Amino acid sequence: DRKLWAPGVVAPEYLKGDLAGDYGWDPLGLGADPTALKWYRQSELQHARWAMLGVAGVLVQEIVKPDVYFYEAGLPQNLPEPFTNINMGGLLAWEFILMHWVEVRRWQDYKNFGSVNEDPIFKGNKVPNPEMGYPGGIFDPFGFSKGNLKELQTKEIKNGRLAMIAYMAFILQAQATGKGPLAALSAHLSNPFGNNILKNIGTCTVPHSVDVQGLTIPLTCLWPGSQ
C-alpha cells in the first residue's frame, strides 16, 4: 500500500517494504539476487553517510572560510597554518593505516554477522549491532536508536539520498563554473538568465594536471567540456 516511485507501476517481488526508504525502484533489477541486495544496501548506507558529511563539510567550510574553494582545498599549500605544506606522503600513511583497520572490521561484520562486535583489546566491551549497518552501542551514545527505529532509518536514507545528489551537484558546478555551491547560488540570483547552466555547461575549469610536492596528479572533468 506504500507509495511507489511512479504512479501505477508494479514494484518488484523482492521489494516488499522490509527496508527503509523502499519505493520499489529497481529498473535494472540489480536486487534480484538476495545476497547482492544486502551488499548493495550497505554501499548505499556508505555513500549516503559519507555524502552527508561531504555536503555538510563543503557548506560549513564555505561559511567559515569563503576563499578556500573546497575543490582546491586538497592542495597542501592551502591547508591550515598548523598543517600547511605537510608531507602528503606521511599524511596519507595515517589515513591508510587507520581506514584499513576500521573498514576491514566493518567488512568482516558483513561476511560473518556478529563476529566483530566485541572489543579486541579490552575484553567485555561490545556493541548491540541490532542490524547490519547499524552498530549502535558506542556508536549511538545518545540512544536515539531506542524508540521508532524504523522511522529514523527512513529519515536517514532519504536525507542521505538527497545528499548524494546534492554533492555531485557541487562537483559538476565547480567543474563548470569554477565556484563553490554558495558562491554559485549568489551568482544565479544576481543574473538569473545570463548566468545559468545553458551558458556554463560548455566549459570545464579544471586544469589538466597539478603538481603536488613534485608528484604530477592527473585531473579530469566528468564531461568533455571545453577546457
Partner 1 sequence: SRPLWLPGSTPPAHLKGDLPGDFGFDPLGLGANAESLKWFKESELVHSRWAMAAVAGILVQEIVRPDVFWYNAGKEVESPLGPLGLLAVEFFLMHWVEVRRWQDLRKPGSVDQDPIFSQYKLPPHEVGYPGGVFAPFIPGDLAELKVKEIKNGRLAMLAFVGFVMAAQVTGKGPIAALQEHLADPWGTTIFSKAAVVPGQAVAPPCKIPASVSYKGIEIPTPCFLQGLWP
Ligand X SMILES: CC(/C=C/C=C(C)/C=C/[C@@]12O[C@]1(C)C[C@@H](O)CC2(C)C)=C\C=C\C=C(C)\C=C\C=C(C)\C=C\[C@@]12O[C@]1(C)C[C@@H](O)CC2(C)C
Binding-site residues from annotation for chlorophyll b = 46, 49, 100-101, 105-106, 119, 155, 220
CA 15, CA 146: separation in Å to the nearest integer?
26
CA 158, CA 151: separation in Å to the nearest integer?
11
Best CA proximity match to 55, nearest among 195, 222, 182: 182
Task: Report if residue 120 touches partner 1, rule: CB under 8 A.
Answer: yes
35: cell is 545476497
Task: Report if residue 90 touches partner 1, rule: CB under 8 A.
Answer: yes
Of 62 and 109, the one with the shorter C-beta distance to ligand CLA is 62
Q: Is 223 exposed, middle or buried (0-12, 13-18, 19+ CB in 10 A)?
A: exposed
Feature table: binding site for all-trans-violaxanthin: 26, 28, 70, 78, 167
How big, in percent rounded to 5, are the helix, strand and coil portions of the chain? 50, 5, 45
Feature table: binding site for chlorophyll a: 5, 23-25, 39, 41, 43-44, 46-47, 49, 61, 65, 100, 103, 105-107, 110-111, 119, 125, 136, 155-156, 158-159, 161, 173, 188, 196-197, 200, 222
Binding site for ligand CLA (CB under 6 A): 53-54, 56-57, 60-61, 64-65, 68, 73, 78-80, 83, 197-198, 201-202, 223-226
